[PDB]
Nucleic acid binder design. Sequence first.
RNA 1: CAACCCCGUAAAAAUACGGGGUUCUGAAACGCCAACGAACAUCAUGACA
RNA 2: UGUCAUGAUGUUCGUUGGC
Length: 750
Amino acid sequence: PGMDLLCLKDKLEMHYFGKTFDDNIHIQLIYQILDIEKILAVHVNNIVFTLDNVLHPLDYQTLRGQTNKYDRFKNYIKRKELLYFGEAFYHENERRYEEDIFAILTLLSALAQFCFAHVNSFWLYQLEDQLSDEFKETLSILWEEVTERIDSEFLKTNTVNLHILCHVFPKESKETIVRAYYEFLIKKSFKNMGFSIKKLREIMLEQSDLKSFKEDKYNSVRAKLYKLFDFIITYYYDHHAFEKEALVSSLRSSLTEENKEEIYIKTARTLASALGADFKKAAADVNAKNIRDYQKKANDYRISFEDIKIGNTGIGYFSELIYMLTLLLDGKEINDLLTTLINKFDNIISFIDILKKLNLEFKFKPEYADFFNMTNCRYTLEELRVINSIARMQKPSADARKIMYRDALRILGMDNRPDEEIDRELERTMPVGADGKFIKGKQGFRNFIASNVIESSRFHYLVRYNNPHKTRTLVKNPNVVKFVLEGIPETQIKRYFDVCKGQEIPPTSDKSAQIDVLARIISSVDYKIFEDVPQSNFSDALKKQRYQAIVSLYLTVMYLITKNLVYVNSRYVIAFHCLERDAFLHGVTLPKMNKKIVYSQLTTHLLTDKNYTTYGHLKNQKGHRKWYVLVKNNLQNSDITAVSSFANIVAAISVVRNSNEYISGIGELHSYFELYHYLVQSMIAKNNWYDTSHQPKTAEYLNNLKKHHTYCKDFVKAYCIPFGYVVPRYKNLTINELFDRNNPNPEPKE
RNA sequence: CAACCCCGUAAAAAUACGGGGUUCUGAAACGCCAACGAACAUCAUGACA
RNA sequence: UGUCAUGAUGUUCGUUGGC
Ligand SMILES: [Mg+2]
């Protein structure tokens, strides 16, 4: 009755709650708690790698007494490439105090030590009684800085709709409209109702009362109309209250889907007859004149609402930590981290409701009781919502731009040269003159680099994750370049080809013809071509666009390789994190031999267990013995040293770092899976991370790689055997067709 | 695209084939990616007391 | 130096195609 395949129901229930239950609602609740740590660990590992790449290697009172850790801290905090991170260590063009930087580094180290599994196992869930009083101030200062920013910035960028809403509602204070509308979009009070207001709006639109807004001229404003109807709806339920309560009971007591549709149609039609005039009044006030007039007077409302906001309210110690992680990430990574966490906490709250409704036990153990209860899980959700809804520009400062000029020219030529030659070329191209000024009328190279390289999101990704000294080798191999261009959709390629065409090639519609032409342009690019850009005539206009297209194509190719190789490494970090978590509960410790770790001990133990072999993934029955044999077959082809060496590569991300010594001998590519594994097998080759005495089969694996210049499929099935106890994960990480969920190829026939 | 469990007709194997399940299995799907749009903030351009 | 036009770079919502 609800027993899981991994055979860990009772252990998890007794670890979290305190006893065993005959129901299938608690274990699904526990898996979400298990899930959040995975993404948290992935991103912590990424941040640590970036910090170690950019910066080459009691309380604060003890720090000075050490005289050795103090010496390292004095220079590490003085190392002046900290400017690459926007607001982590520099605010208002001045360096933060040493204590705050020490606090951030120590907190990052503690979180990294917690996830990759000294600190207790309860650290993340009880921070109130474990955090020192000195570390409770650093988080407060950082959040006080942003709470003043959001207050002044929220009362703008939408000062068109909010004026009309207050005009519709006369008998309400200036506070009330702002409070309700802030509760509407900043933190979604619209989300936590069982109604479908968007569907209800469509059903009302089927009525002639408010479908008179379907004119073609209404296309000038669409988004600022759908939102307005929603807020009017959500306040209508708020004032009625009892009517909303009755509708909930009626919907919950529905028999079939036809009854639900009839009630929704009846509910929609009576709403139109209820406040149809109100709907008409708001929608008739929108036009070009009023929008421009209201935008002119954007300071007619003065509401502070400082008391409500979590900047002054006692924001939790857990949500402040997430904000600290946000300062060390970019726009794309923030969305992935926060959106996953919101989904996790939404589902946790719902499960507790089911347990309460059905009259079942829901209290946790005394250790988890403080954090995991119904009220706290609500509060921690809107705090995660308000963090995600912050506008970020991430401009490249004003002092950090001097360093960025040095690196920008290193990508485009003079890779691995002394800093003396870098400065001379900067002086030679764009001069300074007298009194440290800038020579007017003779400077167009700086504006080109500043507005197309320094202020680009692709460029920041490369500097953080890759070394600009050795980044040029990524575009020297035609096979790698050709594959990346094929991934770009067809619509972009046609645009790029026409602009970068030149005057020596004819127009051709063959996609393969265009790719080869673009490959030669990208291969040979130097900054010396960009020394004649029109300063401040259709010839000048065409030449400016042509130069812009080439540099964007240059960085796009490099940015995709780095991003996708990191993604593949992130998939294997999750796999190793689950092994340590699962081996602890089963009672199986991972031993050592010759200062190594046998990562294949768990799968050996589970191959000879009666319960797992009968009620688990690896099954031994007449008709269900396929994957029991294959894993047992593939176990006898594994090297202890090779598994240990692979674990170190995954943890430290050595594929991205040492990719310039092996990407010059690749044969032919078809997916990012092949490129990642070719590099991994290459390192094991020359570094001699194997042993043919204990397994004479690794010898033939390495011979196939060199004579074919492509990865060997059998060899990846050997060192991934520590994941053999979970069949779906073993298949996904060892067969290329099942790796990416965007490939419809079938599993190869054996 | 794969794993797991029910009910079917042949069968005893690393079991094929036809219907339904699965937050208690793994893949970012409340997610990513392109082209057209309405706002807004940046930077380089002509008209002026 | 404030304003009006003018083309470029990037966030934010929404319509439509593809995963
Ligand atoms: Mg799951």
